[PDB]
């Protein structure tokens, strides 16, 4: 997260860190045994780390639970990142508490201008690299589809939306991938892609979760 702020320990209790020996992606806990992340976060041997703030320090609120199953979206296209969404089932149910909480799925999409909370342990530098140990947060509005598609001509699908600031300076970044974009208490976005980070006219691109709710619920119900 570039241009964001320290969330504060466990203030984003649905934020998970996906770990395969190191943090490599965010995810969002959607119920006690399911995390949603970006399909581009897919790998085998994922451990989901719940209740994290400092991902480098055991602070006492963590639950580390291995993934039992990863389900990448049937239509995920890694070339275009269309349908950049994946479900990860936990081997055992997270113990839900103040610090480890699920985030509700949308029952509909969100409008441009809606303010969202984007969070993650991704790079905090627009130029160069600095990875935070504590969770970073960014409030960002959903951008118009036109501004999104203008920013990334030929690349934005109905399954993506942009959020952030065309002026630059505030964005998600690498390492935030798969993490949540929560707007009005709903997971509306997943950190998916963009160009650089927090660059002018290159806003973050997010998986449009509202398109996937049926798939998510059906998949979870059947798995
Ligand atoms: N659309 C495409 N064909 C495409 C775009 C990027 C990409 O790259 C590797 C996978 C994405 C890895 C995560 O990369 C980012 C980059 C920028 C931001 C941001 N600035 N918000 C957040 C995450 C692959 C395909
Ligand atoms: Ca920790």
Closest Cα to atom 6 of ligand 1: 193
CB neighbours of residue 92 within 10 Å:
11
Whether residues 155 and 116 fall in one domain: yes
* Separation of CA 44 and ligand 1 centre (Å): 20
Q: Does one domain contain both 42 and 90?
A: yes
Q: Tell me if residue 177 is catalytic.
A: yes
Rounded distance from Cα 144 to ligand 2 centre (Å): 36
- Say if residue 34 is in the same domain as residue 132: no
| Closest ligand to residue 143's CA | 1
Answer yes or no: are the C-beta atoms of 161 and 189 closer than 8 Å: yes
| 83 in the same domain as 59 | yes
Q: Which residues line ligand 1 (CB under 6 A)?
A: 40, 80-81, 155, 171-174, 176-177, 191, 193-194, 197, 204
| Distance from Cα 140 to the centre of ligand 2, integer Å | 26
**What approach was used to elucidate this structure?**
X-ray
Candidates 17, 119, 177, 192; catalytic one: 177
Q: Are residues 110 and 189 in the same domain?
A: yes
CATH classification at residue 170: 2.40.10.10
Residue with the nearest Cα to atom 11 of ligand 1? Answer: 193
Residues 116 and 201 in one domain: yes
Task: Give CA 125 to chain center in angstroms.
Answer: 18
Report the alpha-carbon distance of residue 96 to residue 14 in Å, rounded: 10
Gaps in the chain (C–N > 2.5 Å) come after which residues?
none
47/151 same-domain check = no
Q: Which helix H or strand E contains 27, and what residues bound it?
A: strand 23-31
CA distances from 54 to 23, 95, 161 (A): 11, 19, 29
105: which DSSP letter?
P
Nearest-CA neighbor of 59 among 19, 99, 110?
99
Task: Say yes or no: 64 and 138 in one domain.
Answer: no
Of ligand 1's listed atoms, the one at least distance from the Cα of 198 is 20
Domain that holds residue 190: 1-12+103-210
What domain count does the chain have?
A: 2
88 & 158 share domain: no
Contact 120, 191 (CB under 8 A): yes
Cα–Cα distance for residue pair 169/67, rounded to 1 Å: 34
Closest to 64 in 3D by CA, of 24, 95, 97: 95
Tell me how far apart the alpha carbons of residues 185 and 103 are, in angstroms, rounded to a whole number.
7
Q: How far apart are CA 46 and CA 143, in angstroms?
A: 32
Task: Say if residue 174 is exposed, middle or buried (CB neighbours under 10 Å; 0-12, 13-18, 19+).
Answer: middle
- Is residue 22 domain-shared with residue 8, that is, in the same domain? no
């Amino acid at each position: 997260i570039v241009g964001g702020y320290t969330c504060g320990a466990n203030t984003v209790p649905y934020q998970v860190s996906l770990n395969s020996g190191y943090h490599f992606c965010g995810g969002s806990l959607i119920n006690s045994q399911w995390v949603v992340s970006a399909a581009h976060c897919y790998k085998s041997g994922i451990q989901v780390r719940l209740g994290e703030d400092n991902i480098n320090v055991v602070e006492g609120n963590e639950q580390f639970i291995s993934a039992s199953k990863s389900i990448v979206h049937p239509s995920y296209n890694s070339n275009t990142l269309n349908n950049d969404i994946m479900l990860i089932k936990l081997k055992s149910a997270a113990s839900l508490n103040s610090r480890v909480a699920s985030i509700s799925l949308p029952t509909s999409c969100a409008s441009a201008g809606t303010q969202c909370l984007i969070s993650g342990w991704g790079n905090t530098k627009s130029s160069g690299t600095s990875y935070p140990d504590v969770l970073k947060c960014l409030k960002a509005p959903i951008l118009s589809d036109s501004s999104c598609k203008s920013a990334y001509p030929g690349q934005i699908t109905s399954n993506m939306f942009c959020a952030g600031y065309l002026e630059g300076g505030k964005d998600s970044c690498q390492g935030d991938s798969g993490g949540p974009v929560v707007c009005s208490g709903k997971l509306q976005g997943i950190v998916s892609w963009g160009s650089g980070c927090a660059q002018k006219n290159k806003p973050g691109v997010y998986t449009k979760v509202c398109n996937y709710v049926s798939w998510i619920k059906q998949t979870i119900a059947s798995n």
